[PDB]
Amino acid sequence: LGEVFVLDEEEIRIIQTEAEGIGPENVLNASYSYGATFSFQPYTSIDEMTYRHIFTPVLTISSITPDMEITTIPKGRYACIAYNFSPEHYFLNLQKLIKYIADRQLTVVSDVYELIIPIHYRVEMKIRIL
Amino acid sequence: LGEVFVLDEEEIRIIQTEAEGIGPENVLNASYSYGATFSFQPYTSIDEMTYRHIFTPVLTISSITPDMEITTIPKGRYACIAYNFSPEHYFLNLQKLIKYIADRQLTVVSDVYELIIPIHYRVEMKIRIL
Ligand SMILES: c1ccc([P+](c2ccccc2)(c2ccccc2)c2ccccc2)cc1
Ligand SMILES: c1ccc([P+](c2ccccc2)(c2ccccc2)c2ccccc2)cc1
Ligand SMILES: [Mn+2]
């Protein structure tokens, strides 16, 4: 609970649209469940991190347009890590992840998965590994 | 062989980048294995169809940048259909697909998958269903 674990998760159907380049930073500033994903880069700066796809999970056939893609989070082995949301935690949690990966010398096979759940906020990043 | 079938396929890791809006049409004109994907819309016109992601499969850890995403084609049930490439076939093959789906009243859960393989060209569209 605030550390990384490794488990065999289920698939999770979800629907997405693109990120337009908006970044995590972009979302923590200005005055106006889902998730989003990004490249598993050896990061340094939220100024550097920039989202790739933004998503919401399904709860529902039919429903969409072509600007959206019905898809899912592959079943598989995910190095995972959970944390109550805060900002000094956000980046500092990503770090533990990338660290753990480089330490275990594991090989990654997907983008990073950011999952926020308004615990009215809970958060988790899972990456897919072998 | 030139008709649709339904089978339980394996996953297929692949790497992608975006389509920029280029469309199938865009690729059949002008003078200068992989695939690409698009929204399972009730189509009419290649003038209307416009690619979403363009991809290549893996044969190879490491390898990329952030403008590319290591990902895959989920294992699952895919209504599939194969055809030697021609142009009058391209759109006319998509049709059989969408038809078959509406006829079987199946429910789709992914974008359409276009797979070209330079048989030096073989081609297939698979969609994921339940
Ligand atoms: C563009 C528009 C909205 C969001 P987001 C979101 C932020 C960070 C990670 C994933 C998603 C959001 C979150 C918190 C406050 C404002 C906006 C967002 C989008 C759709 C549904 C829920 C949340 C993101 C980019
Ligand atoms: C932009 C640049 C290149 C391709 P494509 C391709 C076309 C149609 C469907 C999938 C992929 C290509 C195909 C045939 C002739 C020219 C270009 C392409 C891209 C990368 C690797 C192989 C093929 C597409 C868009
Ligand atoms: Mn995309």
Q: Given CB atoms, is B71 within the 8 Å cutoff of chain A?
A: yes
Q: Given CB atoms, is A108 within the 8 Å cutoff of chain B?
A: yes
- Test B109 with A72 for CB contact under 8 angstroms: yes
In angstroms, what is the span from residue A124 Cα to ligand 2's centroid? 36
Q: Cβ contacts of residue A6 below 8 Å, gap of 6+?
A: A77, A78, A79, A80, A129
- Least Cα distance to A112 among A58, A20, A43 occurs for A43
Of B41, B65, B69, the CB nearest to A111: B69
Q: Which residues of B touch A48 (CB under 8 A)?
A: none
Count the neighbouring beta carbons within 10 Å of the beta carbon of residue B118: 9
Of all residues in chain A, the one with the smallest CA distance to B62 is A107
- Its domain, for residue B68, covers 1-130
Instruction: Tell how strand A112-117 and strand A76-84 pair up.
Output: unpaired
A15: enclosing H helix or E strand: strand A13-18
CA distances (Å), origin B64, targets A36, A37, B72: 20, 16, 15
In angstroms, what is the span from residue A100 Cα to ligand 2's centroid? 37
- Kindly provide the resolution of this structure in angstroms, with one decimal: 2.8
Task: Evaluate whether B115 touches B126 at the Cβ level (below 8 Å).
Answer: yes
Q: Given CB atoms, is B17 within the 8 Å cutoff of chain A?
A: no
Does residue A85 have its Cβ closer than 6 Å to ligand 1? no
Provide the domain count of chain B.
Answer: 1
CA distances (Å), origin A73, targets A112, A117, B112: 11, 16, 17
Biggest CA pair distance of chain B: 44
Count the neighbouring beta carbons within 10 Å of the beta carbon of residue B16: 21
How far the first Cα of chain A sits from its last, in Å, is 23
A90: enclosing H helix or E strand: helix A87-104
Q: Given CB atoms, is B48 within the 8 Å cutoff of chain A?
A: no
Structure tokens at A5: 């674990």
Strand partners, A35: A55, A115
Q: Given CB atoms, is B26 within the 8 Å cutoff of chain A?
A: no
Q: What is the position in ligand 2's atom list of the atom closest to the CA of B22?
A: 25
Count the neighbouring beta carbons within 10 Å of the beta carbon of residue A41: 15
Count the neighbouring beta carbons within 10 Å of the beta carbon of residue B11: 13
CATH number of the domain that residue A97 is part of:
3.20.80.10
- Test A71 with B110 for CB contact under 8 angstroms: yes
Of B41, B61, B74, the CB nearest to A66: B41
C-alpha torsion sign, points A85, A125, A52, A50: positive
The owner of tokens 């070209």 is: B116
- Torsion-angle region of residue A94: left (phi > 0), alpha (psi -120 to 50) or beta? alpha
Of all residues in chain A, the one with the smallest CA distance to B48 is A66
CA distances (Å), origin A67, targets A9, A64, B94: 28, 8, 19
Of A69, A74, A108, the CB nearest to B111: A69
